[PDB]
TrEMBL record, chain B:
Transmembrane segments: none annotated. The keyword Zinc applies. This is Small zinc finger protein HVO-2753-like zinc-binding pocket domain-containing protein. Residues 15-60 form the Small zinc finger protein HVO-2753-like zinc-binding pocket domain. Zn(2+) binds at C33, C36, C56, C59.
From TrEMBL, chain G:
The keyword Mitochondrion does not apply. Zn(2+) binds at C22, C25, C69, C72. Gene3D superfamilies: Ribosomal protein S26e (3.30.1740.20). Coiled coil: none annotated. One of its GO terms (biological process) is translation. It comes from the Archaea. One of its GO terms (cellular component) is cytosolic small ribosomal subunit. One of its GO terms (molecular function) is structural constituent of ribosome. It comes from Pyrobaculum calidifontis (strain DSM 21063 / JCM 11548 / VA1). The lineage of its organism: Archaea, Thermoproteota, Thermoprotei, Thermoproteales, Thermoproteaceae. InterPro entries: Ribosomal_eS26, Ribosomal_eS26_sf. Pfam families: Ribosomal_S26e. This is SSU ribosomal protein S26E. Keywords: Metal-binding, Ribonucleoprotein, Ribosomal protein, Zinc.
Length: 149, 64, 65, 198, 194, 129, 95
RNA sequence: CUCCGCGAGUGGUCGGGGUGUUUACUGGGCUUAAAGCGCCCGUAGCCGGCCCGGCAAGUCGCUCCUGAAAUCCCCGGGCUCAA
RNA sequence: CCCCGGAGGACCACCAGUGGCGAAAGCGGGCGGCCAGAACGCGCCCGACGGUGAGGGGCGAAAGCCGGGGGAGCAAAGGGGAUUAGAUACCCCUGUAGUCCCGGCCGUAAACGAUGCGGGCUAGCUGUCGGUCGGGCUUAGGGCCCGGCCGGUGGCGAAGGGAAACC
């Protein structure tokens, strides 16, 4: 839910106050960009790509080493998502919930979860239309947006 | 702060770490520094109840 | 974590650790709280297993960065 | 660091044994030193010694007659008794009569300028009257004690008979030395063991 | 009189000759005789007198509850309450408690429509409260007078205040609570961190 | 959701002063908070002001001198004129010699005394006494 | 005026309770607000001299719980009307 | 009978303001006194993180053209003062 | 009453708690599948995208209504046996809707924490739940104990507040 939740957690990562390049790093900025483009072509989304760089390759953060952001690097290197990552995730979640609701029409909890997800989709669409990252004629039609699932 | 206001009456003892005055009908506590005994330590009843620490201006002792 | 208004300078509680793979002997840099199965880049064996907290290491811990 | 009494005597009397509770106040002050894997709180014995020294200097500056030393703990009846017999202070073991400091029309109406309670969590009535009248208060506090209205505290194991007897003997010796009837070398006429109650 | 309580001993021995020193050094007055010794010019007034009853099997047992305000008219005021079966000792008890509860009152100017540096009014804006009567005292220009209720005027005049503006809230018809709230504000003049 | 850092910082200072603390830590901060603290320190209500460079915008550690009797941010931020300063003076302060209003003007954040000296007006921010 | 901070039942952060049926009754209440007094219980008490260690006669005891509403809990003396100060005392209900 | 208040006035009933912090901007309250919609999604509206650069709309300062006269506040003068 | 078999409808005893989940209503046997929403850990991604929300909505106990199925126990209405001055009640026997399932309507409740939602600051002590970190042990287990943080859930209680109960 969004309002009147039972709990209000604090879980989040605490980064250094001003991140810098690690002294122990064995990867140059250009090699970091090629590794990111490799993971993108393999198909991981940007959050997963960042986790992969941090875990497997020991890259703490793309921004200090390269001066850019991960989606900026992917955009420069010929990788352009259809929609923004969070909006696409919300739309896929809504499509999965609707597919479930097709065979289970009396799942009122699932209907409320779908309403929450669709409201989040609407807020994100309002923001993206305001900032120009999506076309101003974009409309959330789940029947015509099945291809994104 | 205060600009040329001459406020009457007895002045109150001032708390030596918070400036909470020992008001009439409320009894604070005034003693000498336990480590030295040179400076005076004044604790209003609020600071005594709250356990507010006090520091000697002369020595480096912090007491209840 | 704690409250940002209570901690003076918040810092990352995790750390980066160098590992030596026991099979081949390659050294690798790896996040301590690895949220995935981290493998050796050469032989391919598993070096770190993910948990809900600090990851479990199968390779020798050469030094914590 | 140089001790009022030897560390073997201290750690045999168990003065630095605290209750297994929590006390964020004492922890922030730094009187808590180490907690074992069974949850037992251990004080800093060096801080214990330094607070004994400063406390002895505190009681030394007051006339002994105007200092009231009180406990309701029966374990502290005897150590406070010999401490106070050797210093010359209004002593009180047993029940603190309410209104002794606030009711001047009472037969036992004492007038004091310093109060010394063995345990403030049990000797609450004396602490309450001291707060109401504005009398300075000294207390042998541990993890369970409430710190309100205590102008001076000595974090120590105020439960055991051995700890109480050793602490009171050390305080009596230091107060005698500060008053001047004893130089810094002599000891009391009786050992610490006579302070321990029976 | 026997100087019961050691402060009374010093006061009768003349080591303390003025009432200002007690409130300067935070000394607690436990006896009224110190007050009559150090303030011979103390005027006491009967602010309120209510009849009060307890129900019992044989009928109500009545007791007078008298409220008394004592003051020197020079910055010293106190108010006390006395319950007694008869009015005379009720007033005596109230006078004794007022004398025990006497306190200094800080005075001065501070009104925007005045510039005199005299003790005619309160030095700053102060508040007091007793149960539900809240009384805010505000400094006023000289010559305005006491702009409070009647019992508030009596308490302020006894405390030695000439001009003031009042702002009250709650049932002021509770005369005891109104008097206590006004006295509370006058005592709260000393809680201001100058 | 956090709305006004100035009112948040002022009420935090008031809470710490009520509890009789020696220092209050102020997070998040802005230049308005810094200039308000500067005016308070200039008039003595607030002691030393140390900046802390945490990554999340900065923090201010302020020393308290036992001088505040009541503090608070006037909200809404009312536009006040030089001829209108005095009624807000009487509205928020006790005594004609005690306390100060804080004003944001085109020459910067200052006290109501300095605003009346410069013969200017502006936006009311807070009060101290 | 609100008697008790418990609402008369230690229910917990929930909206509805499964609720039970009273013994010798049926007025009753949910799982909380009911009395669940336990007794040791055994058939034929003190015949252990004339049975048990005679013949072979192996007996059994069965701890038994009885559930009562407030009316029956007051009626069989399992609950008294304690004073206001003693209302917050934590005592076990005689097993 | 005598005393009290105002007096060429003094009373009755109405309407407005005060009363009234009982309309609350200053400045009320909503556990139990009247008062939190059974719960949640969200449109308009209102309220909104930090830093830097531009503008100068709100805002602030001065000035000008104005906001009829009478009325209102201050000052001087003339009706014997007064109005 | 006891035994041997079959059929049917409801519920999920103890464990079990001011224990958990959920926005509220509400949710208590096991296994499986399909979903949802949180907490915790994180040098993951976006970069203010947020709050509240008139109007407008959607969900919403019990009883009740519409149509279909089912019906063990209980049981409004009703019948009978008692009691009483009366007894159209309270007690006993019995008994139909209803209670259960499916589709819809109803849209109410002491729908209550009688406490709108969001965020910050302000002593503590103590039980318990989830995650996580440090130490010790180990029914060597996803285990137990102590200490810290984060997030819930109870108790007492600083400052403060209140007409007071009290928070
Ligand atoms: Mg919006
Ligand atoms: Mg514990
Ligand atoms: Mg309910
Ligand atoms: Mg009202
Ligand atoms: Mg009501
Ligand atoms: Mg509600
Ligand atoms: Mg309604
Ligand atoms: Mg309703
Ligand atoms: Mg402009
Ligand atoms: Mg909303
Ligand atoms: Mg609506
Ligand atoms: Mg139904
Ligand atoms: Mg039937
Ligand atoms: Mg039947
Ligand atoms: Mg309600
Ligand atoms: Mg109320
Ligand atoms: Zn010193
Ligand atoms: Zn390898
Ligand atoms: Zn004046
Ligand atoms: Zn029953």
């Amino acid at each position: 839910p969004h309002r009147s939740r039972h709990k209000k957690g604090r879980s989040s990562s605490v980064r250094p106050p001003h991140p810098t390049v690690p002294t122990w790093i064995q990867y140059t900025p250009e090699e970091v960009e090629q590794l990111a483009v490799e993971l993108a072509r393999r198909g991981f989304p940007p959050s997963q790509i960042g986790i992969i760089l941090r875990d497997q390759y020991g890259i703490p953060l793309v921004k200090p080493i390269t001066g850019k952001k991960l989606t900026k690097i992917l955009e420069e290197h010929g990788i352009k998502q259809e929609l923004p990552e969070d909006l696409l995730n919300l739309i896929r979640r809504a499509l999965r919930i609707r597919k479930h609701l097709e065979e289970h029409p009396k799942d009122m909890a699932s209907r409320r979860g779908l309403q929450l997800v669709e409201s989040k989709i609407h807020r994100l669409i309002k923001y993206y239309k305001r900032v120009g990252k999506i076309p101003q004629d974009f409309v959330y039609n789940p029947e015509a947006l099945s291809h994104l699932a | 702060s205060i600009r040329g206001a001459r406020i009457y009456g007895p002045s109150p003892p001032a708390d030596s770490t918070t400036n909470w005055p020992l008001a009439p009908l409320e009894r604070g506590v005034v003693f000498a520094c336990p480590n030295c005994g040179k400076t005076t330590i004044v604790r209003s009843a609020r600071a005594r109840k709250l356990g507010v620490p006090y520091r000697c201006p002369e020595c480096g002792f912090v007491g209840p | 974590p704690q409250r940002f208004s209570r901690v003076l300078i918040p810092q990352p509680r995790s750390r980066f650790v160098r590992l030596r793979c026991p099979d081949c002997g390659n050294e690798q840099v790896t996040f301590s709280h690895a949220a995935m199965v981290v493998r050796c880049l050469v032989c391919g064996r598993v070096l770190a297993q993910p948990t809900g907290g600090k990851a479990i290491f199968a390779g020798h811990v050469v030094k914590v960065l | 660091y140089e001790y009022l009494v030897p560390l073997e005597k201290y750690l045999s009397a168990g003065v630095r044994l605290g209750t297994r509770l929590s006390n964020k106040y004492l922890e922030e002050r730094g009187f808590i030193y180490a907690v074992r894997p069974d949850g037992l709180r251990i004080f800093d014995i060096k801080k214990i010694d330094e607070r004994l020294r400063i406390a002895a200097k505190l009681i030394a500056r007051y006339p002994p007659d105007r200092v009231l030393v009180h406990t309701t703990r029966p374990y502290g009846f005897k150590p406070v008794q010999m401490f106070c017999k050797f210093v010359g202070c209004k002593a009180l073991t047993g029940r603190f009569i309410p209104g002794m400091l606030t009711n001047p029309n009472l037969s036992n109406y004492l007038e004091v300028d310093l109060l010394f309670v063995v345990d403030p969590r049990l000797d609450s009535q004396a602490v309450a009257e001291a707060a109401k009248m504005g009398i300075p208060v000294v207390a042998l506090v541990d993890t369970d004690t409430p710190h309100q209205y205590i102008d001076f505290m000595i974090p120590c194991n105020n439960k055991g008979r051995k700890s109480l007897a050793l602490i009171f003997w050390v305080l009596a010796r230091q107060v005698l030395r500060e008053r001047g009837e004893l130089k810094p070398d002599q000891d009391l006429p009786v050992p610490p063991e006579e302070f321990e109650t029976r | 009189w026997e100087p019961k309580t050691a402060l009374g001993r010093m006061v009768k021995e003349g080591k303390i000759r003025t009432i200002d020193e007690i409130f300067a050094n935070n000394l607690l007055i436990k006896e009224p005789e110190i007050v009559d010794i150090l303030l011979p010019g103390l005027k006491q007034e009967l602010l309120n007198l209510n009849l009060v009853q307890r129900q019992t099997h044989a009928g109500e047992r009545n007791q007078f509850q008298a409220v008394v305000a004592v003051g020197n008219e020079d910055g010293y005021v106190g108010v006390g309450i006395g319950k007694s079966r008869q009015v005379r000792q009720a007033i005596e008890k109230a006078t004794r408690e007022a004398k025990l509860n006497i306190t200094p009152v800080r005075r001065g100017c501070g009104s925007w429509k005045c510039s005199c540096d005299e003790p005619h009014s309160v030095p700053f804006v102060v508040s007091g409260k007793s149960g539900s009567v809240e009384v805010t005292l505000i400094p006023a220009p000289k010559g305005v007078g006491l702009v409070a209720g009647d019992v508030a005027k009596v308490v302020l005049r006894l405390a030695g205040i000439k001009d003031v503006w009042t702002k009250t809230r709650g049932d002021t018809r509770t005369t005891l609570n109104f008097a206590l709230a006004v006295f509370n504000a006058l005592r709260n003049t000393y809680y201001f961190k100058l | 959701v956090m709305l006004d850092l100035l009112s948040n910082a002022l009420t935090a200072i008031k809470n710490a002063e009520a509890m009789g603390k020696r220092q209050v830590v102020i997070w998040p901060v802005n230049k308005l908070i810094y200039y308000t603290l500067r005016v308070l320190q200039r008039y003595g209500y607030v002691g030393e002001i140390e900046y802390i460079d945490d990554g999340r915008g900065g923090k201010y550690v302020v020393q308290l001198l036992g001088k505040i009797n009541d503090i608070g941010a006037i909200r809404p931020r009312f536009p006040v004129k030089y001829r209108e300063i005095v009624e807000w003076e009487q509205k928020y302060l006790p005594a004609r010699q005690i306390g100060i209003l804080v004003i944001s003007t085109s020459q910067g954040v200052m006290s109501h005394l300095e605003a009346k000296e410069k013969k200017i007006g502006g936006v009311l921010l807070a009060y101290v006494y | 005026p609100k008697k008790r901070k418990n609402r008369g039942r230690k229910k917990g952060d929930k909206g509805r309770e499964p609720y039970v049926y009273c013994d010798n009754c049926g007025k009753v209440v949910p799982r909380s607000k009911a009395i669940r007094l336990t007794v040791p219980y055994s058939p034929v008490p003190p015949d252990l001299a004339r049975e048990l260690e005679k013949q072979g006669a192996i007996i059994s005891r069965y701890l038994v719980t009885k559930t009562y509403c407030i009316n029956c809990a007051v009626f069989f003396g399992i609950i008294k009307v304690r004073p206001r100060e003693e209302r917050k005392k934590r005592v076990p209900l005689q097993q």
